Amino acid sequence: EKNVSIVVAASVLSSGIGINGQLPWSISEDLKFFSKITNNKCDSNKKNALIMGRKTWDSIGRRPLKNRIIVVISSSLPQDEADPNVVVFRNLEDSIENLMNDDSIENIFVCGGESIYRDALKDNFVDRIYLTRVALEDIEFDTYFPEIPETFLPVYMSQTFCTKNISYDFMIFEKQELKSIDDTVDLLGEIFGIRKMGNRHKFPKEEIYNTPSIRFGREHYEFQYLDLLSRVLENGAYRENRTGISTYSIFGQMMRFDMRESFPLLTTKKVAIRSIFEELIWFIKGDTNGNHLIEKKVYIWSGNGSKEYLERIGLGHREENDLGPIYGFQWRHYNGEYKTMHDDYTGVGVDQLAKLIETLKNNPKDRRHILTAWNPSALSQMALPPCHVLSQYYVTNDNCLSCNLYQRSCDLGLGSPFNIASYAILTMMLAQVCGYEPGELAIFIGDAHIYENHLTQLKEQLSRTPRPFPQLKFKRKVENIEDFKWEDIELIGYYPYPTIKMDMAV
Amino acid sequence: EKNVSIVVAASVLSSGIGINGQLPWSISEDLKFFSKITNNKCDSNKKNALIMGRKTWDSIGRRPLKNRIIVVISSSLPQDEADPNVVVFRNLEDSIENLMNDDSIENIFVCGGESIYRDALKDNFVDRIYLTRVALEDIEFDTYFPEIPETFLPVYMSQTFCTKNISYDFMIFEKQELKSIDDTVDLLGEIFGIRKMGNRHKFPKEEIYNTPSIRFGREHYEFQYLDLLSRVLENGAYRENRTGISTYSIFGQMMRFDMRESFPLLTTKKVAIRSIFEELIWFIKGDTNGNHLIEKKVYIWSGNGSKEYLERIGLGHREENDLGPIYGFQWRHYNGEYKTMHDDYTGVGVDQLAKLIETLKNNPKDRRHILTAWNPSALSQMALPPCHVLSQYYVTNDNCLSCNLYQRSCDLGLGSPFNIASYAILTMMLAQVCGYEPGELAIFIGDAHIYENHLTQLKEQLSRTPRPFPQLKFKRKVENIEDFKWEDIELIGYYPYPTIKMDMAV
Numbered sequence A, B: 001e002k003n004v005s006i007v008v009a010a011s012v013l014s015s016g017i018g019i020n021g022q023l024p025w026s027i028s029e030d031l032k033f034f035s036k037i038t039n040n041k042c043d044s045n046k047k048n049a050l051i052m053g054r055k056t057w058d059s060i061g062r063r064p065l066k067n068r069i070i071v072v073i074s075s076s077l078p079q080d081e082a083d084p085n086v087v088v089f090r091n092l093e094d095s096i097e098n099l100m101n102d103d104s105i106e107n108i109f110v111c112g113g114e115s116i117y118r119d120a121l122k123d124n125f126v127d128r129i130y131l132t133r134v135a136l137e138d139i140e141f142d143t144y145f146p147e148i149p150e151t152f153l154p155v156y157m158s159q160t161f162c163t164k165n166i167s168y169d170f171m172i173f174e175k176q177e178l179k180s181i182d183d184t185v186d187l188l189g190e191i192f193g194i195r196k197m198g199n200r201h202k203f204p205k206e207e208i209y210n211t212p213s214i215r216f217g218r219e220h221y222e223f224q225y226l227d228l229l230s231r232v233l234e235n236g237a238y239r240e241n242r243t244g245i246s247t248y249s250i251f252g253q254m255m256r257f258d259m260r261e262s263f264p265l266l267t268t269k270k271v272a273i274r275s276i277f278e279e280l281i282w283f284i285k286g287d288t289n290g291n292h293l294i295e296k297k298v299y300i301w302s303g304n305g306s307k308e309y310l311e312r313i314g315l316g317h318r319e320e321n322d323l324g325p326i327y328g329f330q331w332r333h334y335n336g337e338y339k340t341m342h343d344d345y346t347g348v349g350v351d352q353l354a355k356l357i358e359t360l361k362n363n364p365k366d367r368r369h370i371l372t373a374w375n376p377s378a379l380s381q382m383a384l385p386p387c388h389v390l391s392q393y394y395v396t397n398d399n400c401l402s403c404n405l406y407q408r409s410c411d412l413g414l415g416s417p418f419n420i421a422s423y424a425i426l427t428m429m430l431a432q433v434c435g436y437e438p439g440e441l442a443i444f445i446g447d448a449h450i451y452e453n454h455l456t457q458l459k460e461q462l463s464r465t466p467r468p469f470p471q472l473k474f475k476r477k478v479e480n481i482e483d484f485k486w487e488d489i490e491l492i493g494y495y496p497y498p499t500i501k502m503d504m505a506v
């Protein structure tokens, strides 16, 4: 009685694993993973058995794998005894004799074709599953990995890796069948009420925890957003705000995202990447004219830039979509005397973005790469004060550009994914213009809240197990950061769950 | 063979537990902890045995404890059989008969006096220790808890709690004698180099991890600073900066601190609390004259305000200690045209602090309680750009004031403890002036670094197991936040480790 694990690499949606007797991709790191996971043994005087079908045995050139014993399932192959590293069995059931006898085999790995997988799961021989999810779906498959039976639960999901612009994951599925510290903490929490800080940051209940079976392996960085949603649903205080829609709010949170091997665009919900990009390039150009976004079919600033909203907050003198000095006016003309959105501001104010780029590519190890939008002198003239308030940038020793963002207020339903993707794109643009590679993205949030009309939606979003992050590449190298266009962005391998409509609070 | 646990409450330094036949304190929550930990059983048809000496039996009025069986060690008390909840034994060894026979006893708790503790540890009967560390040391003791033998290791240290201005901790000591996810993550880290983000955030080695035996119980929030030190020592990249002293640096970190039941002043090192307060009140008053700190024997801004340093950074025109528009000039006179430190600035600039107080006590659930110091227009005039760049404040539904701080650059050796204590004191002042209670303190750090001349020192600081945080109370209620004086602050129960001298990089 020893352990049996399926090892498979399948596509993200249709679970395709093969085409015309070969793999539908060429990912070197995945083969290295197969090698390291099938060689992983505990006894130096024992080998691991790799069970595979005959067509799979043909796919690998009918040559043995070092340090391992290959077990070919076939009804026609001669039961040869010349090669001691290759043995043939007539059916999958008889080949599980490695359990009963043959104490020289430690672990068993089912890694054959669809025919072997399907009745290795049907016969209930499989204890574990090592699944490599690959983000390739608009190609042709003829061999699929069967649907994972409900008796398996995911216990690990790695970060998204990238090979030849192809995104992929690593997951573990397990088949389902000291306490003194926990008891002491529970007793202390019973004694002290909300006096014990742990009780103000309670762990989210299972019913609001995305993919609850993954306890110790929540490595995929989309969990940095779903777990924040869960924490707000668990500990969020019900509070009224400037709008008629109350929120559930907490204070002081953070999220980390990798940008080296993936792009942090949420997969549990289709995110409008084009509107995000157009808003970001609108910021970079220094523009505060709200019509330029409406002309490009981007209506995210329509609510805060209407005649009724502007008159209500005391800006009736302002034109229809004249949002005033906001993001992109403090970026390019900080402390600049604002008049209207039609005036010329070339020369006035402090060009924070230009000085930022100059410092990034002239003094990288400087600790002052800071872009701010909080200007107390101009707050009254704004249609809406800056939410993503401050950002800092950091050049690592291996020429990567990381970004930190402090955001005073975060609408986790709508604003948060937009902010994540927007500052990821901005860091990538800065990295290309300065000659670096994208690094990491940290977001520090003050008032993290969920509007009460989003609950039914966000809980729905928590029911969807995440998929690997896509890739975002630039088609050309620009000369100035303002020259980026939507046609220059290629979004590779983005297979999200369907969009979830959520109304914005004005 | 069942479990035996000492339960004791002792002072932090001298380990005193009694005086004149009674306790040297009156902490109700500690008695509730004793009750809940001695009643904690798994079988409803079994009782727990509480072993105590005769003088301790007198201390509790010679009356039984509900649901438990008291075992009095005494050579003179009559071995009575009338009370089935109290039994007398002539020596401690014979009383351990609960192990061999008497299957109706589940757990055993040694909670007697010094005489019982000392030879319960000497006789090697004790498996666990539940220690309540109390921050009271300048009083009289006549009964002490013996030194914990080296065979025990701490596995848990709670947050600091407060009762009647008395700080206390809860610790567990244990006597010393799935892997698939870890293996998969290790293999992925072998495949991908620094491509896997986990390899850029490696867990600190044991040799640089403060109190390494506490793995799952690092609840005490001083660990939020020691763990950041360890993370920098593990992953910090060696980088040169504007000073001649290079650092080991990482990007994007955070620390949380409770302020409801304690004051986050580090105990692993004696921190100059008076200098912190004087700098903070110097900020609040709007002052940039560095001599006012030197006249009060506070020399922390001398290095960045010398004739040589000012001439080197291009401010030779500036007077000796005229630091320029910095902390407290952007607080009280934001965007105000700075001349010298001698001019009158009452009226010029935006008084951010006053508007902050007004918004805090007039619109608490507002999401714009923001105090900034990053002014791109005034950066060139500063002797040093702002390190603690941005701060946000939050009023909870139970009328507590929490604070978030974004700091662009953090000298973990010198600047970080000062920043922690300083923003804690500032939040407390704002809470008193606005009529709230102190909440939580979150610090978000960009470039967190350790200067290379601090290593030997900081490693030393990592060798000291933390002690409970002290308390900080205000003696009077002021009318304006500027009226605070050093004599108004009472620092209760601060018993730190000796100071560690560390030189500042100019």
Ligand SMILES: NC(=O)C1=CN([C@@H]2O[C@H](COP(=O)(O)OP(=O)(O)OC[C@H]3O[C@@H](n4cnc5c(N)ncnc54)[C@H](OP(=O)(O)O)[C@@H]3O)[C@@H](O)[C@H]2O)C=CC1
Binding pocket: A007, A008, A009, A010, A016, A017, A018, A019, A020, A021, A022, A023, A052, A053, A054, A055, A056, A057, A059, A073, A074, A075, A076, A077, A090, A091, A092, A111, A112, A113, A114, A115, A116, A119, A143
């Ligand atoms: N992405 C991934 O992780 C993997 C992908 N693949 C790909 O999948 C494809 C191959 O899979 P697939 O088409 O299913 O072929 P298989 O690898 O499953 O091999 C099938 C052969 O195995 C034998 N066999 C299967 N079931 C039985 C049985 N119940 N009793 C007796 N013999 C049996 C038969 O051999 P015989 O006719 O001689 O009797 C059969 O022809 C290839 O493209 C391969 O590259 C393969 C492995 C892994």
Ligand SMILES: NC(=O)C1=CN([C@@H]2O[C@H](COP(=O)(O)OP(=O)(O)OC[C@H]3O[C@@H](n4cnc5c(N)ncnc54)[C@H](OP(=O)(O)O)[C@@H]3O)[C@@H](O)[C@H]2O)C=CC1
Binding pocket: B007, B008, B009, B010, B016, B017, B018, B019, B020, B021, B022, B023, B052, B053, B054, B055, B056, B057, B059, B073, B074, B075, B076, B077, B090, B091, B092, B111, B112, B113, B114, B115, B116, B143
């Ligand atoms: N902070 C805390 O957690 C606790 C504090 N305390 C405090 O400590 C003080 C009391 O402790 P302490 O002074 O040490 O007195 P003890 O509680 O240890 O009791 C001592 C008595 O126990 C009996 N005894 C002790 N050792 C032996 C032995 N080897 N064989 C037989 N009998 C023995 C003797 O009784 P006899 O003379 O009758 O034979 C002795 O007089 C009190 O102030 C109490 O409040 C007590 C418990 C917990």
Ligand SMILES: CN(Cc1cnc2nc(N)nc(N)c2n1)c1ccc(C(=O)N[C@@H](CCC(=O)O)C(=O)O)cc1
Binding pocket: A007, A008, A009, A023, A028, A030, A031, A032, A033, A034, A035, A036, A052, A056, A059, A060, A065, A066, A110, A111, A112, A131, A132
């Ligand atoms: C059965 N098969 C098809 C195949 C391809 N990719 C997969 N990928 C995964 N994640 N899991 C599988 N079962 C899998 N199987 C294989 C198996 C081994 C090799 C192979 O050449 N392995 C070398 C790889 C050496 C390397 O590139 O470092 C080894 O040492 O294991 C190729 C195809």
Ligand SMILES: CN(Cc1cnc2nc(N)nc(N)c2n1)c1ccc(C(=O)N[C@@H](CCC(=O)O)C(=O)O)cc1
Binding pocket: B007, B008, B009, B023, B028, B030, B031, B032, B033, B034, B035, B036, B052, B056, B059, B060, B065, B066, B110, B111, B112, B130, B131, B132
């Ligand atoms: C022996 N002793 C002295 C005393 C005082 N504080 C301690 N504190 C600790 N952490 N550990 C001890 N062994 C301890 N012992 C005791 C023991 C019980 C009670 C007592 O009254 N216990 C009630 C407490 C009721 C409560 O306040 O809710 C109980 O239910 O156990 C007082 C003093």
Ligand SMILES: N#Cc1ccc(C(=O)O)c(NC(=O)c2ccc(Cc3c[nH]c4nc(N)[nH]c(=O)c34)cc2)c1
Binding pocket: A269, A271, A272, A275, A299, A300, A301, A304, A384, A411, A413, A414, A415, A418, A499, A500, A501, A502, A504, A505, A506
């Ligand atoms: N699922 C989903 C989904 C699908 C489509 C879209 C889309 O528009 O294509 C979308 N996004 C928004 O609707 C959106 C996003 C970001 C913003 C930014 C903003 C400015 N002012 C704010 N005020 C408040 N309260 N909240 C805010 O988010 C903001 C404003 C609107 C979400």
Ligand SMILES: N#Cc1ccc(C(=O)O)c(NC(=O)c2ccc(Cc3c[nH]c4nc(N)[nH]c(=O)c34)cc2)c1
Binding pocket: B269, B272, B275, B299, B300, B301, B304, B384, B411, B413, B414, B415, B416, B418, B499, B500, B501, B502, B504, B505, B506
């Ligand atoms: N252990 C210990 C210990 C004991 C005594 C003292 C003391 O002075 O009583 C002390 N503190 C400082 O020396 C100190 C603290 C904070 C500051 C703030 C600051 C301004 N400019 C900076 N430049 C750089 N590089 N680093 C900085 O921290 C700053 C400047 C100096 C530490």
Ligand SMILES: O=c1[nH]c(=O)n([C@H]2C[C@H](O)[C@@H](COP(=O)(O)O)O2)cc1F
Binding pocket: A241, A242, A384, A385, A387, A388, A409, A410, A411, A412, A414, A415, A416, A419, B367, B368
């Ligand atoms: O980038 C943004 N992210 C975001 O979450 N909001 C939401 C947060 C909140 O719902 C509202 C700000 O309201 P207030 O100014 O009162 O904090 O805008 C707005 C942005 F522009």
Ligand SMILES: O=c1[nH]c(=O)n([C@H]2C[C@H](O)[C@@H](COP(=O)(O)O)O2)cc1F
Binding pocket: A366, A367, A368, B241, B242, B384, B385, B387, B388, B409, B410, B411, B412, B414, B415, B416, B419
């Ligand atoms: O409150 C402070 N906190 C702090 O950490 N520093 C340190 C951080 C850094 O080591 C140095 C200067 O930072 P920089 O070199 O980016 O100007 O001051 C200074 C303060 F005033």
